[PDB]
Amino acid sequence: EVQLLESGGGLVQPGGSLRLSCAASGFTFSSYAMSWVRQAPGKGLEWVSTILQHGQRTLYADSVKGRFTISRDNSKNTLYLQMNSLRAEDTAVYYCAKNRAVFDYWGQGTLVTVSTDIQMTQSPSSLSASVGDRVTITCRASQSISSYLNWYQQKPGKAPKLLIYTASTLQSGVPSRFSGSGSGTDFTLTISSLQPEDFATYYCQQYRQRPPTFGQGTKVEIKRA
Protein backbone atom coordinates (compact mmCIF):
# COMPACT_ATOMS: atom_id res chain seq x y z
CA GLU A 1 0.00 0.00 0.00
CA VAL A 2 1.06 3.60 -0.66
CA GLN A 3 1.69 5.67 2.46
CA LEU A 4 2.51 9.36 2.90
CA LEU A 5 3.12 10.64 6.44
CA GLU A 6 3.56 14.37 7.04
CA SER A 7 5.10 15.96 10.12
CA GLY A 8 6.45 19.31 11.27
CA GLY A 9 3.25 21.31 11.64
CA GLY A 10 2.77 23.57 14.62
CA LEU A 11 2.14 27.06 15.91
CA VAL A 12 4.64 29.76 14.93
CA GLN A 13 4.92 33.53 15.07
CA PRO A 14 4.65 35.65 11.90
CA GLY A 15 8.04 35.88 10.22
CA GLY A 16 9.14 32.60 11.80
CA SER A 17 10.10 29.43 9.99
CA LEU A 18 9.07 25.77 9.88
CA ARG A 19 10.30 22.61 8.18
CA LEU A 20 7.76 20.02 7.03
CA SER A 21 8.68 16.43 6.24
CA CYS A 22 6.91 13.74 4.26
CA ALA A 23 7.80 10.06 4.56
CA ALA A 24 6.85 7.93 1.57
CA SER A 25 6.46 4.18 1.20
CA GLY A 26 4.82 1.69 -1.13
CA PHE A 27 6.15 3.08 -4.42
CA THR A 28 9.42 3.99 -6.10
CA PHE A 29 9.89 7.43 -4.53
CA SER A 30 12.64 8.52 -6.95
CA SER A 31 10.46 7.67 -9.99
CA TYR A 32 7.96 10.48 -9.36
CA ALA A 33 7.74 14.20 -8.83
CA MET A 34 6.31 15.20 -5.46
CA SER A 35 4.14 18.17 -4.56
CA TRP A 36 2.79 20.12 -1.61
CA VAL A 37 -0.82 21.30 -1.74
CA ARG A 38 -2.36 23.35 1.07
CA GLN A 39 -5.89 24.12 2.23
CA ALA A 40 -6.59 27.20 4.33
CA PRO A 41 -9.23 26.79 7.07
CA GLY A 42 -12.63 26.84 5.39
CA LYS A 43 -11.12 27.41 1.94
CA GLY A 44 -10.28 25.32 -1.11
CA LEU A 45 -7.20 23.45 -2.27
CA GLU A 46 -4.13 25.40 -3.42
CA TRP A 47 -1.03 23.95 -5.05
CA VAL A 48 2.08 25.17 -3.22
CA SER A 49 5.18 23.53 -4.70
CA THR A 50 6.52 20.67 -6.81
CA ILE A 51 9.95 19.00 -7.04
CA LEU A 52 10.99 16.71 -9.90
CA GLN A 53 12.19 13.10 -9.73
CA HIS A 54 15.86 13.64 -8.84
CA GLY A 55 15.63 17.13 -7.36
CA GLN A 56 16.69 18.60 -10.69
CA ARG A 57 14.01 21.29 -10.93
CA THR A 58 11.58 22.95 -8.53
CA LEU A 59 8.40 24.94 -9.11
CA TYR A 60 6.65 27.22 -6.64
CA ALA A 61 3.41 29.13 -6.44
CA ASP A 62 3.73 32.91 -6.65
CA SER A 63 2.48 33.41 -3.08
CA VAL A 64 5.38 31.34 -1.69
CA LYS A 65 8.16 32.14 -4.19
CA GLY A 66 11.24 33.34 -2.33
CA ARG A 67 10.01 32.20 1.10
CA PHE A 68 9.50 28.45 0.58
CA THR A 69 12.06 25.85 -0.47
CA ILE A 70 11.21 22.29 -1.49
CA SER A 71 13.75 19.46 -1.35
CA ARG A 72 13.91 15.68 -1.32
CA ASP A 73 16.18 12.91 -0.07
CA ASN A 74 15.66 9.90 -2.34
CA SER A 75 17.84 7.78 -0.06
CA LYS A 76 15.57 8.50 2.92
CA ASN A 77 12.43 8.54 0.70
CA THR A 78 11.62 11.91 2.26
CA LEU A 79 10.22 15.22 1.02
CA TYR A 80 10.85 18.55 2.74
CA LEU A 81 9.22 21.98 2.64
CA GLN A 82 11.19 24.73 4.36
CA MET A 83 8.80 27.62 5.04
CA ASN A 84 10.56 30.89 5.90
CA SER A 85 9.13 34.35 6.58
CA LEU A 86 5.75 32.89 7.46
CA ARG A 87 2.60 35.01 7.27
CA ALA A 88 -0.97 34.68 8.50
CA GLU A 89 -2.10 33.70 4.98
CA ASP A 90 0.18 30.64 5.22
CA THR A 91 -2.01 29.17 7.99
CA ALA A 92 -3.39 25.98 6.43
CA VAL A 93 -3.33 22.20 6.41
CA TYR A 94 -0.38 21.19 4.22
CA TYR A 95 -0.70 17.99 2.20
CA CYS A 96 1.93 15.81 0.60
CA ALA A 97 0.84 14.59 -2.82
CA LYS A 98 2.32 12.29 -5.45
CA ASN A 99 2.89 13.50 -9.04
CA ARG A 100 2.80 17.04 -10.45
CA ALA A 101 -0.53 17.23 -12.31
CA VAL A 102 -2.72 14.23 -11.41
CA PHE A 103 -2.37 13.92 -7.63
CA ASP A 104 -3.33 10.25 -7.28
CA TYR A 105 -2.21 9.86 -3.64
CA TRP A 106 -2.33 12.26 -0.70
CA GLY A 107 -1.08 12.20 2.86
CA GLN A 108 -3.34 13.05 5.76
CA GLY A 109 -1.84 16.52 6.11
CA THR A 110 -0.24 18.55 8.89
CA LEU A 111 -1.72 21.78 10.24
CA VAL A 112 0.46 24.90 10.23
CA THR A 113 -0.80 27.81 12.34
CA VAL A 114 0.66 31.33 12.20
CA SER A 115 -0.23 33.67 15.06
CA THR A 116 -2.80 35.08 -15.45
CA ASP A 117 -3.65 31.58 -14.24
CA ILE A 118 -6.63 29.54 -15.41
CA GLN A 119 -9.60 30.02 -13.09
CA MET A 120 -11.90 27.11 -12.26
CA THR A 121 -15.43 27.82 -11.04
CA GLN A 122 -17.68 25.16 -9.51
CA SER A 123 -21.45 25.25 -9.21
CA PRO A 124 -23.30 24.87 -6.95
CA SER A 125 -21.08 25.95 -4.04
CA SER A 126 -23.09 23.72 -1.70
CA LEU A 127 -26.10 21.45 -2.06
CA SER A 128 -28.31 19.36 0.22
CA ALA A 129 -29.37 15.92 -1.02
CA SER A 130 -30.52 12.51 0.21
CA VAL A 131 -29.41 8.92 -0.28
CA GLY A 132 -30.58 7.67 -3.67
CA ASP A 133 -30.62 11.13 -5.25
CA ARG A 134 -28.84 12.10 -8.46
CA VAL A 135 -26.21 14.83 -8.03
CA THR A 136 -24.69 16.90 -10.84
CA ILE A 137 -21.72 19.25 -10.30
CA THR A 138 -20.47 21.67 -12.94
CA CYS A 139 -16.88 22.85 -13.30
CA ARG A 140 -16.14 25.70 -15.72
CA ALA A 141 -12.74 26.99 -16.86
CA SER A 142 -11.75 30.53 -17.81
CA GLN A 143 -10.11 29.18 -21.00
CA SER A 144 -10.03 25.88 -22.88
CA ILE A 145 -8.34 23.10 -20.93
CA SER A 146 -9.14 20.31 -23.43
CA SER A 147 -9.76 17.21 -21.30
CA TYR A 148 -7.02 17.89 -18.70
CA LEU A 149 -9.49 17.99 -15.81
CA ASN A 150 -9.50 15.96 -12.59
CA TRP A 151 -12.09 15.43 -9.85
CA TYR A 152 -11.15 14.91 -6.19
CA GLN A 153 -13.34 13.80 -3.29
CA GLN A 154 -12.62 15.04 0.24
CA LYS A 155 -14.70 13.35 2.93
CA PRO A 156 -15.19 15.24 6.22
CA GLY A 157 -12.05 15.07 8.35
CA LYS A 158 -10.11 13.30 5.56
CA ALA A 159 -7.59 14.11 2.87
CA PRO A 160 -8.58 14.53 -0.79
CA LYS A 161 -8.97 11.39 -2.89
CA LEU A 162 -8.60 11.22 -6.67
CA LEU A 163 -11.91 10.26 -8.31
CA ILE A 164 -11.62 11.10 -12.01
CA TYR A 165 -8.63 12.02 -14.15
CA THR A 166 -8.60 13.37 -17.70
CA ALA A 167 -12.28 14.39 -17.48
CA SER A 168 -13.88 10.95 -17.72
CA THR A 169 -11.51 8.16 -16.61
CA LEU A 170 -12.48 6.53 -13.31
CA GLN A 171 -9.66 5.88 -10.85
CA SER A 172 -9.10 2.25 -9.87
CA GLY A 173 -11.49 1.31 -7.08
CA VAL A 174 -14.05 4.08 -7.64
CA PRO A 175 -17.72 3.00 -7.80
CA SER A 176 -19.48 3.11 -11.16
CA ARG A 177 -22.11 5.56 -9.88
CA PHE A 178 -19.47 8.28 -10.35
CA SER A 179 -19.08 9.50 -13.93
CA GLY A 180 -17.38 12.51 -15.46
CA SER A 181 -17.81 14.22 -18.81
CA GLY A 182 -17.03 17.47 -20.57
CA SER A 183 -14.48 19.16 -22.77
CA GLY A 184 -13.11 22.60 -23.47
CA THR A 185 -14.35 24.90 -20.71
CA ASP A 186 -17.38 22.97 -19.37
CA PHE A 187 -17.29 19.78 -17.27
CA THR A 188 -19.73 17.79 -15.15
CA LEU A 189 -19.35 15.22 -12.38
CA THR A 190 -22.43 13.05 -11.83
CA ILE A 191 -23.33 10.75 -8.94
CA SER A 192 -26.20 8.64 -10.25
CA SER A 193 -27.38 7.35 -6.85
CA LEU A 194 -26.05 8.95 -3.67
CA GLN A 195 -24.72 6.66 -0.97
CA PRO A 196 -24.06 7.73 2.64
CA GLU A 197 -20.29 7.70 2.03
CA ASP A 198 -20.60 10.06 -0.95
CA PHE A 199 -21.41 13.09 1.25
CA ALA A 200 -18.22 15.13 0.92
CA THR A 201 -16.69 18.15 -0.79
CA TYR A 202 -15.72 17.68 -4.44
CA TYR A 203 -12.97 19.68 -6.15
CA CYS A 204 -12.07 19.99 -9.82
CA GLN A 205 -8.49 20.68 -10.89
CA GLN A 206 -7.05 21.58 -14.29
CA TYR A 207 -3.57 20.52 -15.37
CA ARG A 208 -3.71 21.98 -18.87
CA GLN A 209 -1.44 24.83 -17.72
CA ARG A 210 1.32 25.19 -15.17
CA PRO A 211 0.63 25.84 -12.33
CA PRO A 212 -2.31 23.49 -11.72
CA THR A 213 -5.35 25.25 -10.25
CA PHE A 214 -8.39 24.07 -8.28
CA GLY A 215 -11.98 25.14 -7.99
CA GLN A 216 -13.45 26.42 -4.74
CA GLY A 217 -15.24 23.09 -4.26
CA THR A 218 -18.81 21.83 -3.93
CA LYS A 219 -20.04 20.62 -0.53
CA VAL A 220 -22.59 17.82 -0.80
CA GLU A 221 -24.29 17.46 2.59
CA ILE A 222 -27.27 15.54 3.92
CA LYS A 223 -30.60 17.38 4.10
CA ARG A 224 -30.91 18.97 7.53
CA ALA A 225 -33.77 18.09 9.87
Final residue in a domain of this structure, among 114, 138, 167: 114
124, 110: one domain: no
Final residue in a domain of this structure, among 59, 84, 114: 114
How far apart CA 220 and CA 131 sit, in angstroms, is: 11
Is 128 within 8 Å of 222 (Cβ atoms)?
A: yes
107, 126: one domain: no
CB neighbours of 95 closer than 8 A, spacing ≥ 6?
6, 36, 37, 38, 39, 106, 107, 108, 109, 159, 160
Between the alpha carbon of residue 221 and those of residues 1, 125, 178, 201, 225, the distances in Å are 30, 11, 17, 8, 12
Query: Quick one: 172 exposed, middle or buried, by C-beta within 10 A (0-12, 13-18, 19+)?
Result: exposed
CB neighbours of 30 closer than 8 A, spacing ≥ 6?
53, 54, 74
Resolution (A): 2.8
Q: Which domain holds residue 140?
A: 120-222
126, 164: one domain: yes
144, 89: one domain: no
Q: How many domains does the chain have?
A: 2
